[PDB]
Each structure stands twice: as C-alpha cells, then as structure tokens.
C-alpha cells in the first residue's frame, strides 16, 4: 500500500518539471531529514492515542487540534483531484481495447496537420508534434488556452469519473476491499508492471541521456525555490503524511507494536519505488528525445501528463501494445483505487468521528457517503472541462501538495518537540515501541524538519515565482489566488482552531494557553 500514483505518476513529472537531476538532492534531503521522521511521528501519534484524526490531538496538546481539520481539508481536496487522475486512467483504459492504440499513429480527427509519427521525425530534420502529446492534449485533456477559458464540460470524461466514483461508492461502505486476493495481485502486480516498464525503458536506444538528465544535477537549478518545495511535498505526498491516513492507520494497531522498522521499511520502499519509476520514465524520455531530435527537457509535458505520455509511448514500443496498455491502465486504476479507498475511508471515518450521533451508523451513514461522493464529483467536474488540466495543476500544486503540507508537517514537529517535548514523546515511544528514538528522529523533530519546512516556506515567498503549466502557460492572478485559497483552507485550519479554542476557554491568556497545551 506504499505504491501508487504519487510514486508512478507524481514524482516523474515533478522531477521533469524541476530539471531532473537537481530534483533528487532536496528529495533525499527531505526524505531523510523530514519525511521519514514525520512518517514515524504520525504513526506513533496514531498508535499512542487510540483514536485518530482530530481527537488524537487531545492527549497531544489540545491547543493545536486544528492539525486534524487541516488533514480533513487536505484529504478532501486530494480525493477530488486524485479521482480525476483515475478518470484520465479510465479514459485511457477504454481507449486501449483498439488494436492500434490512438496515441501510436498519426491519422485521426484530433491530430493537427503538424503531426508526424515518432519514428519518422528524425528523417525530417521544428513545429512537429508527437502523437502521444497530441492524443493526450486534444482527446483526453481536450486542452483549451487557459484556466480563464474553461471551454465546455467534456463528455465521457465525466462518465469515466462517474464510473470510478460508483466503484468508490460500491466498495467503501456498500462493500469491502481486497482481503484474500492481496497475495499475488494488487500488491505485486504494480511492482511487476513497473519492472516490465523499467526493463523496457533501460533497453531503449538513446535512454542513456535520459538517465543522465535524471541523475546528474543542475546546481544552478538548486537555487530555485520550486525544486525544494516540490521535493518536500512530493515526499509528504507519497507518504500521505499530512493526511490523517497514517494516524488512522496507527489507531488500528496494538499498543506495544513495533512501528519503527515497519515505518522505515514502508518509507524506504516507497521512495525506492519512486526512484525506480523515475528511472523507467526518464529512460523512456531519453529514448523519446533521441527519436524526435528535440531536447530531453522539451520532449514531453512538464506537468501531470508525463505518466500519460511516457508510459503510453513505451507501451507503443513494446511487443503486443494492446495487452500491455490494458494491463498498465488497470494497474493505474488499481493503485489509485486502493489509495482512494484508503483516503475516502479515512475522510469518512474522521468525519463521523468529528460528529458522533449527528450521522448515525447505518441508514444515515450510507446517505453521507453518497452526499460526500456527489460533492467531490461536482468539485471534480471543473477538472474534466476543456481547461480542466489547469484547474488540476492548480490543485496538485496548491490544494494538497504545497505549502499546506509543509505547514502541517512543521506544525506537527513543532508541537511535539517544543510543546509536548521530545523527551516526553520519547518516553511514550519507549513505552510503546520498546526504545526511545535516537538523535536522528529527536533532532529532526526538534530542528531539521521545522528548519527545512520554514526555510523552504520563506524561500518560496522571498524569491516568489508564479505557478506555470508545461513551462509556457503563465497562470492568471485570480487562478493563483484560488490556488492560494485552496492551500490556506488547509493552512488556516490550525490558527482558526487556536483562536476558537482561546475564545471558548475562560481566564487570562496564560491560563488559557496552559490549559490548552497540557494534554488530556
């Protein structure tokens, strides 16, 4: 369950968006200084406090109980755009049943006169566009000229979104999840498919330059603020470690259960899966740049279509493309459906824990599933429009993988270390795990993760650069404002809860602070 679209889809395009080589240095810096400490942190908070989500910050500093509300906002927005990823994957899966895949050859209705098939491009020398980018942008995306031009609601993307939301409704509380078929399927089938796509990509001609672009850093790119924050929020994204999902996972664990080796195994496996998927996709992109005669950084989308360009293009250069296209997009749907089952189950669980007996279990709980799925549908219908990828990129940069993740991780590490105490928390960990954490975890919660999150947060503001889609489209200022509103809807869940809890507690400021930072 640490394998998913955040590994096989998000880390490749975030690496491609940030120059490839220079993305990995803040990636590993955040993975070691920040990401695995916060992973162990929320798993321990979910294990210590027997509940999770909001009411786990009741025996851990009740003043900062807004971390749960921040996680609820984050998981709602993540549910919306992560299910529209699944809608794109379903649209590709239904288009995979053709013998000749529509992104393989050049003569269709959506293709421009500037089309050329990929193997023919090196013979002709330059304003010539590959069929994978053409199929993506003008059949799947049906991409408009901006977010201020939404175009029209594209049909059958809404039907793919309806299919994946009906599968989510019929498998979360009207049904069950995978229990006995987890062996040899849905746990190693994505790893097998990643192995197949990796051994395809590494044996491709010209794929050495793609690995060179992937691994060798650009030191001048490390001074960009976007690289550090993209790497940090990619670590916090693929771990889902500002989400409440891992806190809810720790609630379904025993008290004296060893959850250190499990956490570092899951985190290192997740980051290694991301690294292997990056190897695969960037080898495919090196092959693509070799074939098309264009630069490696300009061969495909510098946005969230890289897994929908590089992987389908490698499926075309594979024996029997139809079979592997069907298996690959069923794999994408299985990864994203498992992660969406986990996150919608966590959102539903923490929302009915937020209001007990306002939603009774049984008849009215089932109505609440339909209500929340319908609301996330109507918020997801602005992403299957013509200009729906711009809304999606706004969500992916801002809603659940931006300064909100840095804010929640910094506030969790700060609350634990400097209000709850690293020594008191280590005493709790010793009582549960068996040993108190070493100086790595202690000084990461105390120094390294607050310093990294605060430094990248201020570095993304002093040298502010606007969000750009595919390196060419500058976003409008109202779109940046809407994305910042999406970020601040999670970010302001902490100080609004602080102000509310200070207002609802009587006494002077010192007495209120003392009552609300002493645990219950």
């Amino acid at each position: 369950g640490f394998v998913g679209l955040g590994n096989v889809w998000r880390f490749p395009y975030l690496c491609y968006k940030n120059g490839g080589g220079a993305f990995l240095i803040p990636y590993f810096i955040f993975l070691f200084g920040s990401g695995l400490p916060v992973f162990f942190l929320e798993v321990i908070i979910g294990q210590y406090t027997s509940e999770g989500g909001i009411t786990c910050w009741e025996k851990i500093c009740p003043l900062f109980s807004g971390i749960g509300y921040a996680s609820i906002v984050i998981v709602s927005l993540l549910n919306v755009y992560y299910i529209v990823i699944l809608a794109w994957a379903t649209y590709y899966l239904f288009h995979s049943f053709q013998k000749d895949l529509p992104w393989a050859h050049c003569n269709h209705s959506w293709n421009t006169p500037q089309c050329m098939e990929d193997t023919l491009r090196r013979n002709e020398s330059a304003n010539f566009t590959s069929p994978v980018i053409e199929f993506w942008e003008r059949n799947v995306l049906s991409l408009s000229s901006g977010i201020d031009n939404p175009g029209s609601l594209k049909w059958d993307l809404a039907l793919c979104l309806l299919l994946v939301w009906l599968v989510c409704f019929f498998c979360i509380w009207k049904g069950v999840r995978s229990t006995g078929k987890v062996v040899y399927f849905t746990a190693t089938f994505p790893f097998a498919m990643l192995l197949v796509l990796l051994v395809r990509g590494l044996t491709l001609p010209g794929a050495g330059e793609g690995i060179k672009f992937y691994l060798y850093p650009d030191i001048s790119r490390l001074g960009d603020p976007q690289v550090w924050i993209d790497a940090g929020t990619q670590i916090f994204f693929s771990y889902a470690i500002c989400l409440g999902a891992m806190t809810s996972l720790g609630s379904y664990n025993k008290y004296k259960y060893n959850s250190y080796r499990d956490c570092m195994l899951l985190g290192c496996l997740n980051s290694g899966t991301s690294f292997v998927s990056g190897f695969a996709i960037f080898s495919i992109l090196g092959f693509m740049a070799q074939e098309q005669g264009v630069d490696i950084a300009d061969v495909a989308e510098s946005g969230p279509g890289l897994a929908f360009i590089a992987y389908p293009k490698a499926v075309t250069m594979m024996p029997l493309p139809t079979f592997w296209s069907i298996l690959f997009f069923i794999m994408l749907l299985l990864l994203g459906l498992d992660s969406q089952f986990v996150e919608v189950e966590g959102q539903i669980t923490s929302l009915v824990d937020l209001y007990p007996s306002f939603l009774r279990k049984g008849y009215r709980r089932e109505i609440f599933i339909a209500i929340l799925c319908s609301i996330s549908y109507l918020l997801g219908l602005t992403m299957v429009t013509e200009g729906g990828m711009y809304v999606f990129q706004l969500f992916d940069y801002y809603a659940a993988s931006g300064v909100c993740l840095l804010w929640v991780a910094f506030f969790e590490c700060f609350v634990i270390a400097w209000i709850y105490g690293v020594n008191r928390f280590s005493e709790d960990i010793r009582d549960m795990i068996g040993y108190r954490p070493g100086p790595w975890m202690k000084y990461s919660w105390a120094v390294i993760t607050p310093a990294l999150c605060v430094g990248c947060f201020v570095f993304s503001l002093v040298k502010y650069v606007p969000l750009t889609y595919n390196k060419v489209y500058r976003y409008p200022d109202w779109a940046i404002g809407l994305g910042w509103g999406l970020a601040l809807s999670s970010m302001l869940c902490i100080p609004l809860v602080i102000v509310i809890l200070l207002c609802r507690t009587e006494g002077p400021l010192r007495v209120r602070i003392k009552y609300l930072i002493t645990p219950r």
């Epitope: 004296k256 020594n423 008191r424 010793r430 009582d431």
Partner: antibody, heavy 118, light 108 residues
Framework: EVQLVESGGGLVKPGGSLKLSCAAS????????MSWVRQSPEKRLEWVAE????????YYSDTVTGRFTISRDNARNILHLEMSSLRSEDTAMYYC????????????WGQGTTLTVS | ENVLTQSPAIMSTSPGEKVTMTCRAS???????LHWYQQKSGASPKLWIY???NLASGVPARFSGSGSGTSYSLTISSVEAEDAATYYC?????????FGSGTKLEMK
C-alpha cells in the same frame, strides 16, 4: 562509567515501611527508564517495579501491585522505592537495574542492599 | 504472568566443554526482547546477552545465543573457570517482566 549505588538496606518489622535509594551516576538519569529487581534468599530473581524515564509510566509486579511505590529524582539522579504493608515473604536482596531499551534489558545493575523481615 | 521455565539450576560440567541451556516461555516472546544475565556468587547480575543473540560489553565471543518465540538457548563454546555463575533468561516485552529460574554452572 555507569554506577548505581543503592541505600536504605536494613531490618524492618512486618507490615512496616522502608525507603530504598538507588543513587545513580555516570549517565543521564532522565533519559533511561529504571527498575527495581529483588532476589529471594533461595536465589530467585524477581522484577519488582519499573518506572519510565520521565516518571510517568510506572509498572508493578503482581506481588507488589498495591503496596510498593517507585519514584525518581531526575534533578539529583536518585531512584527511590517507597514501601508499605511489607509482608513476611518480602525479605530479599534488592537491586536497582537500568533498563531503558526493552530489547537491551537491564544492562547496568546496582550494588547489593538486603531487606530482612523479622 | 509470562513464566519462563528455564533449564534446571544444578548443572555440573567440566571446563572446556560445549554446553547449552534452554529457556522455555509460557507465552511467546518476540525474540528481540529476551535477554540473558550472568550473576556470579555473591555479586550483582550483569547484562550478558541481549536481544537473544547479541553480546553485551565485556562478554567473550565464546558465548552465543539462539532461539525465537518460545524456546531460547544460551550456548558456551568452551567453559573456563570464570564462567561459573548463574544465568537468568529474561523476556522484557510483556509489561509483567519476568526472569527465568536458576541455571547455576558448577565445576567438576
């Protein structure tokens, strides 16, 4: 060098009280959980009580679960063991044992103070 | 309680002989939490083997430990005159922490 020095060893009446005092040195006392282990005169080791590093999580054996009280002094590095309702079958040889990692066990033990019931 | 029934206390073995001693537990110990202590005659116990295999500081390499779950074993490759003491096995996972019985190694 880790040194655990015990005190308070003496003869007490049944149903009485005694103050044991494990004075530790050579290590930070606030970061290691400490335990009292007694040894019966027929040489049978028995863990009595464990206190955590901060003094918050306190565990007791089934024999002494309601009449023994273990506490620390993290400022001056002394572990205590208060006693009351001390029955006849409590004459033993009491060691203070430093066990913080549950997978390392009691790596450092103390010196010997004898409790005698008569 | 997790009663650790250990090998009988009175074992008499000549020096230089490979010896072993068992430690059966009533419950199941997680095999990273069972430790062995060597208490000499009239002296305090000291940590000898921790996490059922690793060797404590000042312990020679001739001692070794094995076993998991229920049955746990301490093994001496060759016995010398400084190995004449009582060995207690000790789970330290379950919160009523229990030591084993005696296993006193006397000479011949």
């Amino acid at each position: 060098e880790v040194q655990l020095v015990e005190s308070g060893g003496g003869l007490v009446k049944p149903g009485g009280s005694l103050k044991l005092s494990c004075a530790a040195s050579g290590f930070t006392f606030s970061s290691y959980a400490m335990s009292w282990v007694r040894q019966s005169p027929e040489k049978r080791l028995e863990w009595v009580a464990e206190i955590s590093s901060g003094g918050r999580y306190i565990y007791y054996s089934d024999t002494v679960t309601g009449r023994f009280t273990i506490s620390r002094d993290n400022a001056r590095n002394i572990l205590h063991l208060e006693m009351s309702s001390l029955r006849s079958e409590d004459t033993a040889m009491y060691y203070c044992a430093r066990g913080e990692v549950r997978q390392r066990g009691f790596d450092y033990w103390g010196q010997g103070t004898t409790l005698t019931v008569s | 309680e997790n009663v650790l029934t250990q090998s009988p206390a009175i074992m008499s073995t000549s020096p230089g002989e490979k010896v072993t001693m068992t430690c059966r537990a009533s419950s199941s110990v997680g095999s990273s939490y069972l430790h062995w202590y060597q208490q000499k005659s009239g002296a305090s116990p000291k940590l000898w083997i921790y996490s059922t295999s690793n060797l404590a500081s000042g312990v020679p390499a001739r001692f070794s430990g094995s076993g998991s779950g229920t049955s746990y074993s301490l093994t001496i490759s060759s016995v010398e005159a400084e190995d004449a003491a009582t060995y207690y096995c000790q789970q330290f996972s379950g919160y009523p922490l229990t030591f084993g019985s005696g296993t006193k190694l006397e000479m011949k």
